[PDB]
Every structure is written in C-alpha cells, then in structure tokens.
Amino acid sequence: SAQTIEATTVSQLEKAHVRIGDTLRLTGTGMCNIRTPDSPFLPFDCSQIVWNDAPPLPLPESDIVSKATALMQSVQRQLHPETSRVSPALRSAIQKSGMVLLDDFGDIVQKTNDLCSAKDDCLRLKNALVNLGNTRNWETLTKRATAGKLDGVNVLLRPVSAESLENLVTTSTAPFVIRETSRAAQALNSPAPGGFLIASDEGSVLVNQPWPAVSLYDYPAHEQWGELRRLAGMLMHTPFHAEGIVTNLFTDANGTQHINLHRI
Numbered sequence: 001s002a003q004t005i006e007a008t009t010v011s012q013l014e015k016a017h018v019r020i021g022d023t024l025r026l027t028g029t030g031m032c033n034i035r036t037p038d039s040p041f042l043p044f045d046c047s048q049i050v051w052n053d054a055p056p057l058p059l060p061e062s063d064i065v066s067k068a069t070a071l072m073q074s075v076q077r078q079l080h081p082e083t084s085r086v087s088p089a090l091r092s093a094i095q096k097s098g099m100v101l102l103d104d105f106g107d108i109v110q111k112t113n114d115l116c117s118a119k120d121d122c123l124r125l126k127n128a129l130v131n132l133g134n135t136r137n138w139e140t141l142t143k144r145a146t147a148g149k150l151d152g153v154n155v156l157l158r159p160v161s162a163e164s165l166e167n168l169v170t171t172s173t174a175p176f177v178i179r180e181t182s183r184a185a186q187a188l189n190s191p192a193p194g195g196f197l198i199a200s201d202e203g204s205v206l207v208n209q210p211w212p213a214v215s216l217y218d219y220p221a222h223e224q225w226g227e228l229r230r231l232a233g234m235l236m237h238t239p240f241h242a243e244g245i246v247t248n249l250f251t252d253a254n255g256t257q258h259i260n261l262h263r264i
Contacts, residue, residue, distance in 0.1 A: 026198060100162040
C-alpha cells in the first residue's frame with residue numbers, strides 16, 4: 001500500500017524506502033543541479049535538487065580573475081578619477097589642455113605584466129603600452145616598470161586614445177575571466193555518490209530565492225564571474241521544498257536515488 005512520507009534529512013528519506021505512487025513532502029537543505037550549456041537561475045537548475053550529506057563544494061576562487069580585476073581597476077582609477085597623486089594646479093591645467101592623465105603608468109604596466117605574463121599574451125595591449133611608454137619593446141618597459149623607474153610618472157593621452165586604451169584593457173582581459181568562469185563552473189559540477197536527485201515533473205522551481213535580474217550570460221565577461229559566484233553562493237546549500245506523487249524512481253550505479261515528483 002502507498003503511504004505519505006514526510007522527510008527533512010537524507011537519512012529519513014532513505015529509511016522510508018519510497019516507491020512509485022507514494023506521496024512525498026520533502027524540506028531540507030541541498031544543492032540545485034548545475035547544467036553544462038528557459039530557466040531563471042541559469043546555469044543552475046532548481047527544478048532538480050541534489051540532496052545528500054556530503055559537505056557542499058567550495059565557492060569559486062581564482063587569482064587570475066583578481067589579477068584581471070586589478071588591471072581593469074588601475075586603468076579605471078586613472079581614466080575616470082573623482083578625488084590622483086598629483087598637484088591640483090597641475091590637475092586643472094591638464095584638463096584645460098583637452099587631455100587625460102595617467103598618474104601611475106608604472107602600475108598599469110606591472111598589472112599587465114602580472115596578468116599577461118606568458119610571452120605571447122595581449123600583444124595589442126603591450127604594443128599600446130610600449131608606444132605610450134616611448135620604449136622600443138615590451139621587455140624594456142616591463143623592467144623599467146618593475147625596476148621602479150616608472151612609479152608615479154605621468155602620461156597624457158588625447159581622449160580618443162584614452163577611450164581606445166580602456167576598451168583595449170577590456171577586450172584583452174575578457175578571455176581570462178571567461179576561461180576562469182568556465183573552469184569554475186566545471187569544478188562546481190562534481191557529484192557525490194549516494195543521496196537523492198529530486199526532480200519536478202512540471203519543471204517547478206523548488207527554492208525560494210530572489211530571481212536574477214538578467215541571465216548570467218547576458219552579463220559582460222568580467223561580471224559573469226561575479227554573478228556566477230553569487231549564484232553559487234545561494235544555490236549550493238539552499239533550503240528547498242518538494243512535494244508531490246513519485247512518478248518515477250531509479251537508483252543509479254553510483255547509488256544516487258533519482259526521484260521524479262508531480263505535484264498533486
């Protein structure tokens with residue numbers, strides 16, 4: 001005979017030995033299933049819950065990403081400031097000359113060397129810095145920079161050139177974040193054995209978390225990392241609720257019990 005099963009831990013649901021036709025009411029803390037490339041929390045799918053007592057996986061971390069962020073911020077700090085090592089009288093005069101000031105060219109070269117370390121990285125960007133720096137090649141520039149012979153030194157750009165350089169830092173760092181974002185996503189998709197995978201027949205979302213303003217990949221590359229990290233922050237160990245009748249049930253090789261639920 002069919003029964004109603006109420007369970008709040010993985011153990012309780014295992015002890016209940018569910019069958020097809022049973023009615024489950026399930027509330028616990030678990031993880032939303034993550035899909036490799038419709039659904040609000042893309043790439044997570046919270047119509048499917050991975051429920052088991054293996055400790056949750058760690059949030060994404062990358063030092064490449066923070067190197068990329070350092071570079072983009074040093075450039076933004078200098079192209080669009082709002083307070084600038086330099087004397088105020090000098091500051092106003094440069095603005096009146098129709099020009100833009102980098103007051104720490106040395107930091108930008110170091111940050112670029114930091115991220116684009118491998119000899120064939122970001123050649124457009126290194127060439128732009130070389131021309132700004134009045135050297136012959138990138139490698140002299142990096143040493144003078146790393147030496148400390150460029151700290152606080154002042155470079156001036158026509159505004160069209162400064163726009164182009166900001167976009168150049170932008171387009172060159174994007175592939176770094178895109179890779180690391182991708183790498184992090186795959187590291188989030190490592191499934192423990194045992195436990196359950198609870199899926200909603202009608203594709204019902206099964207968590208109560210705020211829906212995201214826009215999908216993760218409508219974001220610009222550098223902010224995709226930030227959002228994926230946020231999405232994982234609230235969806236890898238979230239309270240969930242799932243109730244309905246069991247319409248299918250199967251224990252895979254790994255010992256995970258897949259359960260499909262149709263609500264009432």
